[PDB]
Scaffold this active site. Structure first.
Site, short mmCIF file in Angstrom:
data_model
loop_
_atom_site.label_atom_id
_atom_site.label_comp_id
_atom_site.label_asym_id
_atom_site.label_seq_id
_atom_site.Cartn_x
_atom_site.Cartn_y
_atom_site.Cartn_z
N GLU A 1 13.50 15.40 0.79
CA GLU A 1 12.76 15.89 -1.18
C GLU A 1 13.69 16.11 -1.65
OE1 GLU A 1 9.72 16.90 -1.34
OE2 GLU A 1 8.25 17.42 0.26
N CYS B 1 13.80 21.71 -9.54
CA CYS B 1 13.14 19.91 -9.14
C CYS B 1 11.60 19.11 -9.76
CB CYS B 1 12.91 19.50 -7.35
SG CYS B 1 11.80 20.78 -7.01
#
Lengths: 509, 509, 509, 509
Positions: free
Chosen positions: B267, B301
């Site tokens: 991720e 993010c």
């Protein structure tokens, strides 16, 4: 005396569109001007015919033509792509006998198994036709009023496919049918020692694409060695690399693909174990064990390499398997009597001899076999070895040859642990009548393999299920269940269709 | 001025079980004797309290205690594991305010978002309770008479979790809830700069495990830097490594895990784009763009990094966004008025200044912001930059700071291509009213991201769906859909239950 | 002027295995000695050929032979049953033109649509081949240690299939392919007015079964009227009754099946609405509306019966549809570009005339059509009627004839409500460009139908999705998604494989 | 003397919000002015308290308020509805002991089982929370370019729920949790003899709805007899009727619902068989058989009614079960020592005595029990009867009383057939160690029931799986797998988003 293809005895090869020299590149048009390779029949070491492999520049050009073909291909609805896959299935069906014969001639496996391999492609095509109307993700209920939430699946783009020698048709097929159904375009580099099979298959597929006015580059082929294989592994334009081969080579390829954040599907080595318990049906065990070990001359990735026998039945079972080994009919792969053919290459024969040596050195006793057969071709005796420790280095190594290592065990815990202790994790079997044992074997403290069988050998596998292994076998899955997902990219999509505005939270707009 | 924790204004920190010095290892018992790190509050650069990180030897010992705990844990039925996850959800619920406050204090995000993060963990726990009665594969119809064919899913074993600084509670949570439900044991190494949050969470989880007489090592924690992180990446005993962090570090970790054939969940970085078309509802676009860019001080993010405006609306929208930026209330993260807090570290401030510089060099014009704010803490002005080319190196780079790069486009084809041209592939949004455009954006020639949104910004994502990206974002998925599969191993199981024997095919038994 | 079949112009009928008189019973052997029915061509009212229908005693005997066949059939693995279904698909493919021609001749629909209907059966066969390796339920995690929990699906047994006249091949096909794949045996009673098509289809299927050495009773046929149909409805040996037909007859059948606790699949009447909003693409609306209303002479269950036009576009759209109606070329069933044929029977013509009169009495104005055409066959003019109230009794009734009732609306709420207000609930469409409207239409306050379309008419439906309606349409589903479940029985299975004993709770054993 | 509720020993009833007289209608407000019923404690035949049931007019008004509540409720996102369900689960958890005690007091089952029933509701709530983020259909690939194809699921509207006496909390719960999660509103008519439990539950649910500012009519209740129940069955405004009760009453209701084309979910009678084979673990069989027969005084729909013993073990097993029967502690349901309480009503006692009579008449021998116990309450002796033929009329009848009919068998074929020969089809079990037998039992020639168990009795069932039966048991399913679909309507949706126009095919527009 010359190439086999020029002899009348072998003119059926011309039905596959094969000639003395063959172009090893297809991308909508045929060509190739790299190294000329000569494909030998492992049954008599006679040359069959030649294939002109790709240069890097020709690979390069093939990737561009493939990428361009994808544009139009991705725009074709999935059920309509399935219609193409259906026709590939049928085109193959028409050529099943001669293609099966080529597999048998070029790879070395018996005719009926050559035909069986073609059937795998045919059957996976029909399966893919079903999938073409099914692939996709759930519509999900969003927590936000006036918002739709859906899971979308889309083609990854170009699927590079690198295949092994032992299944020169089916492995490609399993990948081709699914990838095509999923709106991808394929580039195929088959094993250097089976380029005629690669070309033959590509010819059949190419014709179907052309009948349907589709760019041939949707199913491209570039024959070659590590050469081209490495280029694919490093190529950012290859969206998914499917690799079927040795776990040693697979690692090099995996590391290269990981380096550039590409997608990979890994189908690597096996060290497959059959575990026979005290209560097993021995009339089932013996023939199962024989055919699983001896089939394809021990050259399936799923071949039984380790046979674990409970101490109570050990000596009786070994002896019975040995009696069966004597009746294994060794001969020409084209002959309907033959159950067992040659090893694929001469190097294979050397691995066999070396593994025999190491087995002896590590305390193994030869029950039978062990010798190179005195005849044309790469023929070796099917070998059984007793006495080795469960963790003898040779037992833990995959040697792609017809040697069966026999282990003696006492407790269930032991057998399960020995099954799991190796670095491979493809296939596994127990033979038992015990209800509790079956489900323990299937559960979290049982087998750690991708294939986990009960009362059927290690090569028992069908289209409907996902195929592949764990640990050093590489994680990839082919054919059944939701294997298709590896050939597509998931997107989680939220659609706001309301007129609602977000809270201003103190700011004036 | 000493440690914040010793001051009465901060004695609520004691409700989280925190003290002046804190043990950074938990594995059923607490300890740690590695480097002592001091955690600073980014709002005023004042030290909060200390955490004693793990030594390699303490990591080593934690892995053994974890492996041992797995044995008993894997034997507990999934719905009963879900009962544990349910209680973790509740234990968190009780401490939501103080834990949210700690996140705000130690990471720097506003209080309401600290609380929201804790809610993510709570909500994913309840989701996991549902899954605990659902996880599994299909029963499949075998082609062989008297044969059962089933797909089995089993725990991978130990899940190593390495998390980023920006979401110190939720990322671990998303992984914890699912992994535990799936019969795995966890080992957690949180970001070096948020060890107090790591400890606080671990304390809450530990208590629940202990209330239920379960070995604490089921949810182990070892705080540390690259040091321990690398050990995990290289450790064969870590069955799955879940990594949330920079795409630069992720790569190193990925390569290490690939090397040893381990499973990874990646991720990584994002370079998320909002594309505003001519027909977009501008009253929706403006607040969406502001909050998506400015939220968490540009440190999600999923934060919008690239805002693409159609030439027809470009100048009008930029100006409106600029007017909103002026009203963004900058202040103490603890303060309910504050919408915009400090950057997480001083290094972050330097990246911000450097990216400003490079933006100018590459032809960018500052619409607003660009200066370090003259006050305690790591405060920087939220910045908007127009005029850069779509492929200006700085635009293609993820800089984890509140800078928004504004791009001007004309054609749909252009915007889509620019969205896809970068190496990241986490999140993406278009704002439009055009039915056909929506589905094209969702289809094969649309966005190449893991999150593909319409009329909602790049940070719009909920538990129900799989979360993660493509390309350089790493491929991993968290939380929803069938994400759980990454935390388990698939096995295709064939059970022969008939008395049928295999064909003898010429051999006498 | 004799039977059509005896004339050379019609000798292609002999390719379908048809003769002057035809047996109407098949159950492994052919026969029938009930009433002799004569099938007329609705294009010229000329007799085609005769079929001898079943007696109750012959139905009775067919059910026994069917039940007996099931025993061996249910024992054949699903993928192997799919192989049979695949071959049926192919056998049909070979006879597509002549079979399509028969449908066109006996039912009255245009040749291309006759061919299209055959294709539906072919395509659903290939879909079923996919399903044959997929059908089944989940393996579930039990809450009890050492317990397996699985969902099993098994054949219901014998599937009775009663079909309507308007799709004499496809409806049977949709049921046949799925039921067979699911391990059921079929008994088919086709519409009394299309027995030649029933026989022709049965002949094709029978040959495939016989090629494969399977009992022919796996796909039995008994032609007849309400007579036999009622017997099936009441027969406890019919495990599932699939009924396609009028909602009036469906109800009688339903009540009879309910009475004996049998399973039923109901595919009944429709009163399908197209709703055209202000922002609709009128260049799309007009041709869509025309073909959906006029196709098959208004005799599809999905045919548009109600066309709702927003007041702003009402008069313009009606007039454009009227201009198109003038160009609808009446020709003969076979022929090149005939776009419209006869009504199926004379009674149909009477319904048409009666509905016209009721429309007038209820305040309707004829825009066009309304008159029986002065020519051989059951030809009537395609009719458009404006001015009726949304709840005019005639509008709420399904009249299986080419009349289109035009409604004028203002608000979205109105149109949606009028769509839902009727007792039928098969198909529905809205034409609009509004993103929000689309999803509202799809959501809980939108259409209440089984088919809910946007910018495609009411007859837009494909194999991949479940087909069927709600309310008075009957609830049943055919073909796609998980429709197959209706053809099988679910069992929730718990297997205890442990040695664990239950708590004695005070009792000594 | 007087009502139990007025006595101090029973003042815990006030914690459930119960009083001397209780309103039997809730629809956002409490009331009821129909027949006043007095609820008796079956353990001593003493009156507990009264409930004022609904008039038809009050039912009528409740349906309107329910329909109105649905409007706002259907607009709330599924995960947000799950949040309500979660809180219902928690509200129940707080009152588990006292509510369990009420079940025990009013129905007659032992305290621990009263608590267990409440737990079923609690556990299904948590399951539903998972489902609230999951429910929906697939996104499917359309065959048409530029067309989206999705399966949508939407609330049916109002779910009417009619429950039986024996599980007055759980059956409602199983339906409530799912229906609510699926965006439906509920109307509950509990068994006439358990209205206090109905009210108590409704009170708990009502409070949660009101805490959350939701219209109370989302979970309405109207207590009453056949009276109200019939009205529901006939009511077109009831979109789905869930009926749990006798197969006799179920049929009447089914026929009424079918008449008006409503949706039904039928959970009717059982005649559940345990089949014990020669190789069975008898130490498991004996306690399993005892508890499955004797539990709840033989008043679970899943209770073992038929015990089939292989001739080889028949006499030994019967005798062992008989020895266990002697130690079954009969007494006050509130006493923790008691394993076996009273029958629910006096009529139940009469059925028991009548079935005893018929058993004797049909050649049965009483092994034990058969007599009404001389004591306060509806206490009867648990009875075992040997010697009856497998098809003795009494054996084929469900008598809701603690009588166990013992059958002697030889072949597997026999036992399986006898299991299937009855009209009921709820639950079934075999006890065996034979691997092949297990899977035959699970396959197409095995059990025809909805629950098919191995080495666990007929009452072994958990939340994760679908619950319900076949044949005369009614087809409905509750709780697990995809049971939710019964509470929603499927729509197959095709969205054309392209600019493509349909072929003009000769017509000018």
């Amino acid at each position: 005396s010359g190439l086999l293809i020029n002899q009348p005895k072998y003119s059926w090869l011309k039905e596959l569109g094969l000639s003395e020299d063959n172009p090893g590149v297809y991308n909508g048009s045929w060509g190739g001007s790299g190294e000329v390779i000569t494909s030998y029949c492992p049954a008599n070491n006679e040359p069959i015919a030649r294939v002109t492999q790709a240069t890097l520049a020709e690979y390069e050009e093939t990737v561009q033509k493939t990428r361009e073909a994808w544009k139009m291909w991705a725009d074709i609805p999935a059920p309509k792509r399935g219609e193409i896959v259906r026709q590939i299935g049928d085109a193959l069906r028409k050529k099943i006998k001669v293609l099966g014969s080529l597999v048998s001639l070029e790879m070395g496996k018996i005719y009926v198994e050559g035909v069986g391999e073609v059937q795998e492609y045919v059957d996976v095509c029909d399966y893919a036709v079903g999938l073409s109307r099914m692939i996709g993700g759930p519509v999900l209920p969003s927590e936000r009023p006036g918002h739709a939430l859906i899971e979308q699946w889309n083609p990854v783009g170009l699927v590079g496919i690198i295949t092994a020698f032992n299944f020169p048709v089916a492995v490609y097929g399993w990948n081709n049918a699914i990838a095509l159904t999923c709106g991808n375009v394929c580039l195929w580099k088959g094993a250097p020692t089976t380029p005629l099979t690669s070309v033959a298959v590509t010819k059949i597929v190419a014709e179907v694409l052309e009948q349907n006015n589709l760019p041939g580059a949707i199913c491209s082929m570039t024959c070659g060695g590590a050469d081209i294989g490495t280029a694919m592994a490093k190529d950012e334009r290859v969206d998914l690399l499917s690799f079927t081969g040795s776990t040693h080579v697979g690692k090099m390829v995996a590391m290269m693909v990981q380096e550039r954040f590409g997608r990979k599907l890994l189908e690597l080595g096996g060290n497959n174990a059959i575990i026979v318990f005290e209560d097993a049906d021995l009339n089932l065990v013996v023939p199962s064990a024989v055919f699983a070990s001896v089939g394809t001359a021990g050259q399936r990735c799923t071949t039984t390499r380790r046979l674990m026998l409970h101490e109570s039945v050990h000596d009786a079972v070994v002896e019975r398997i040995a009696k069966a080994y004597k009746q294994v009919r060794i001969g020409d792969p084209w002959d309907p009597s033959t159950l067992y053919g040659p090893l694929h290459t001469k190097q294979a024969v050397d691995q066999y001899l070396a593994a025999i040596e190491q087995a002896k050195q590590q305390g193994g006793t030869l029950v039978c076999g062990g010798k190179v057969m005195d005849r044309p071709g790469n023929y070796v005796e099917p070998t059984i070895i007793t006495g080795l420790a469960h963790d003898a280095p040779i037992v833990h190594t995959e040697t792609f040859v017809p040697i069966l290592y026999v282990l003696k065990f006492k407790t269930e815990e032991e057998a399960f642990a020995w099954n799991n202790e190796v670095q491979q994790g493809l296939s596994s079997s127990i033979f038992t009548k015990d209800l509790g044992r079956v489900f323990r074997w299937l559960g979290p403290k049982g087998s750690d393999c991708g294939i986990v069988n009960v009362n059927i050998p290690t090569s028992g596998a069908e289209i409907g299920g996902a195929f592949g292994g764990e640990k050093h076998t590489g994680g990839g899955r082919e054919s059944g269940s939701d294997s298709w997902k590896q050939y597509m990219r998931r997107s989680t999509c939220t659609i706001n269709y309301s007129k609602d505005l977000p809270l201003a939270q103190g700011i004036k707009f």
